[PDB]
Scaffold this active site. Structure first.
Site, mmCIF file in Angstrom:
data_model
loop_
_atom_site.group_PDB
_atom_site.id
_atom_site.type_symbol
_atom_site.label_atom_id
_atom_site.label_comp_id
_atom_site.label_asym_id
_atom_site.label_seq_id
_atom_site.Cartn_x
_atom_site.Cartn_y
_atom_site.Cartn_z
ATOM 1 N N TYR A 1 -6.455 1.957 -15.691
ATOM 2 C CA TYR A 1 -7.690 2.030 -15.167
ATOM 3 C C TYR A 1 -8.382 3.588 -15.632
ATOM 4 O O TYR A 1 -7.805 4.318 -16.172
ATOM 5 C CB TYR A 1 -8.263 1.598 -13.843
ATOM 6 C CG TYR A 1 -7.299 2.106 -12.836
ATOM 7 C CD1 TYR A 1 -7.178 3.681 -12.548
ATOM 8 C CD2 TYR A 1 -6.390 1.722 -12.219
ATOM 9 C CE1 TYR A 1 -6.620 4.183 -11.622
ATOM 10 C CE2 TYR A 1 -5.488 2.091 -11.207
ATOM 11 C CZ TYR A 1 -5.948 3.328 -10.874
ATOM 12 O OH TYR A 1 -4.922 4.211 -9.797
ATOM 13 N N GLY B 1 4.670 -0.125 -1.156
ATOM 14 C CA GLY B 1 5.277 -0.678 -2.538
ATOM 15 C C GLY B 1 4.603 -1.785 -2.746
ATOM 16 O O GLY B 1 3.127 -1.977 -2.420
ATOM 17 N N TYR C 1 -4.395 -6.002 -4.504
ATOM 18 C CA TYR C 1 -3.831 -6.371 -5.549
ATOM 19 C C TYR C 1 -3.820 -7.777 -6.039
ATOM 20 O O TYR C 1 -4.027 -8.286 -6.977
ATOM 21 C CB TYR C 1 -2.404 -5.718 -5.797
ATOM 22 C CG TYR C 1 -2.406 -4.543 -6.429
ATOM 23 C CD1 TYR C 1 -3.316 -3.576 -6.422
ATOM 24 C CD2 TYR C 1 -1.125 -3.895 -6.921
ATOM 25 C CE1 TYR C 1 -3.446 -2.250 -6.698
ATOM 26 C CE2 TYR C 1 -0.898 -2.769 -7.466
ATOM 27 C CZ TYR C 1 -2.155 -1.797 -7.273
ATOM 28 O OH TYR C 1 -1.851 -0.723 -7.915
ATOM 29 N N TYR D 1 5.229 -2.397 3.943
ATOM 30 C CA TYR D 1 4.425 -2.907 2.783
ATOM 31 C C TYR D 1 4.214 -1.725 1.920
ATOM 32 O O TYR D 1 3.463 -2.049 0.814
ATOM 33 C CB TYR D 1 3.168 -3.276 3.294
ATOM 34 C CG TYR D 1 3.288 -4.704 3.921
ATOM 35 C CD1 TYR D 1 3.521 -4.984 5.119
ATOM 36 C CD2 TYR D 1 2.999 -5.867 2.913
ATOM 37 C CE1 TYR D 1 3.816 -6.329 5.583
ATOM 38 C CE2 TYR D 1 3.356 -7.203 3.352
ATOM 39 C CZ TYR D 1 3.870 -7.511 4.845
ATOM 40 O OH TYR D 1 4.168 -8.697 5.066
ATOM 41 N N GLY E 1 4.764 -6.486 -2.729
ATOM 42 C CA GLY E 1 5.583 -7.517 -2.177
ATOM 43 C C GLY E 1 6.457 -7.537 -1.145
ATOM 44 O O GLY E 1 7.336 -8.145 -0.990
ATOM 45 N N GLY E 2 5.740 -6.581 -0.124
ATOM 46 C CA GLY E 2 6.401 -6.521 0.891
ATOM 47 C C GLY E 2 6.417 -7.834 1.942
ATOM 48 O O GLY E 2 5.850 -8.686 1.725
ATOM 49 N N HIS F 1 -3.709 -3.049 0.718
ATOM 50 C CA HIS F 1 -3.369 -2.764 -1.097
ATOM 51 C C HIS F 1 -2.998 -3.771 -1.616
ATOM 52 O O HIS F 1 -3.190 -4.106 -2.606
ATOM 53 C CB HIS F 1 -2.487 -1.118 -1.028
ATOM 54 C CG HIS F 1 -2.556 -0.820 -2.254
ATOM 55 N ND1 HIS F 1 -1.332 -1.117 -3.060
ATOM 56 C CD2 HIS F 1 -3.233 -0.261 -3.202
ATOM 57 C CE1 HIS F 1 -1.283 -0.386 -4.484
ATOM 58 N NE2 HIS F 1 -2.628 -0.186 -4.529
ATOM 59 N N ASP F 2 -1.830 -4.230 -0.862
ATOM 60 C CA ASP F 2 -0.949 -5.297 -1.540
ATOM 61 C C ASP F 2 -1.845 -6.561 -1.619
ATOM 62 O O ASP F 2 -1.844 -7.169 -2.577
ATOM 63 C CB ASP F 2 0.144 -5.520 -0.808
ATOM 64 C CG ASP F 2 1.187 -6.642 -1.315
ATOM 65 O OD1 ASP F 2 2.433 -6.478 -0.867
ATOM 66 O OD2 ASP F 2 0.893 -7.781 -1.666
ATOM 67 N N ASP G 1 -6.406 1.084 -5.108
ATOM 68 C CA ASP G 1 -5.636 2.366 -5.209
ATOM 69 C C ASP G 1 -6.228 3.476 -4.421
ATOM 70 O O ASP G 1 -5.786 4.083 -3.813
ATOM 71 C CB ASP G 1 -5.136 2.840 -6.652
ATOM 72 C CG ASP G 1 -4.048 1.842 -7.449
ATOM 73 O OD1 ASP G 1 -3.660 0.916 -6.814
ATOM 74 O OD2 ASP G 1 -3.801 2.057 -8.370
#
Length: 122
Positions: free
Chosen positions: A64, A29, A51, A27, A31-32, A47-48, A89
């Site tokens: 940001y 990155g 988002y 994961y 779109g894991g 984190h994914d 982040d």
């Protein structure tokens, strides 16, 4: 933006940190797929998903507001959607730091082919 996420990672984790963290496990990155490999990868899974909660603005692309003083990260600004991105982040970076002692280079650039199992949903 991911550009900023990289700058944040470099600030909190050191110069090697972008490359160290933004292909790791299943994961780190975006779109894991599959199952998180370890705690660091779980930071990335969260984190994914984080988002994925950003509906107002584009967490990949949009820029940001944040501070970098004395080694850490505080998010700021008065656009709450951008601040939400920043917090995804920042949280991840702090999670990377918190889990540094279980970073395992086996998972560095692990590769999607090693993560072809059922994906854990957000």
């Amino acid at each position: 933006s991911l550009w900023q996420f990289g700058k944040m990672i470099n600030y909190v984790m050191g110069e090697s940190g972008v490359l160290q963290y933004l292909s790791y496990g299943c994961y780190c990155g975006l779109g894991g797929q599959g199952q998180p490999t370890d705690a660091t990868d779980r930071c990335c899974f969260v984190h994914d998903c984080c988002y994925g909660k950003v509906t107002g603005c584009n967490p990949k692309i949009d820029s940001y507001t944040y501070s970098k003083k004395n080694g850490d990260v505080v998010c700021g600004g008065d656009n709450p959607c951008k601040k939400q991105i920043c917090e995804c982040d920042r949280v991840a970076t702090t999670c990377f730091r918190d889990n540094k002692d279980t970073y395992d280079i086996k998972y560095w650039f692990y590769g999607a082919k090693n993560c072809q199992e059922k994906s854990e949903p957000c």
